[PDB]
């Protein structure tokens with residue numbers, strides 16, 4: 001239980017919060033991979049080269065894929081960046097991304113040193 005383990009516990013706590021009922025009203029678009037075909041978004045995978053979502057982050061955390069907090073944060077921010085790249089900035093889904101990213105960034109900032 002070095003610094004990396006302690007920081008990954010903080011990351012796991014954040015992940016649990018992002019998936020919690022407290023944030024469900026704006027977190028739900030990020031729960032599962034974007035289903036482009038189901039949504040009729042036939043340009044999604046031409047625009048987004050590296051899809052990411054909270055179920056994928058959860059699988060990677062469960063599989064001990066993340067070696068440090070920075071690697072975890074990069075996936076969570078990739079998920080938000082994909083949303084900001086693909087969707088017009090006035091769309092409800094972007095408002096929901098902004099709100100969940102505020103939750104993420106303020107708690108990520110409280111990382112134990």
Ligand SMILES: COc1cc2c(cc1OC)[C@@H](C)C(=O)N(C)CC2
Pocket residue numbers: 029030034041082083086087091092093
């Ligand atoms: C609320 O409407 C939308 C939901 C979703 C998306 C887009 C939506 O509005 C167009 C896709 C493209 C997206 O970025 N995520 C993150 C998944 C779901």
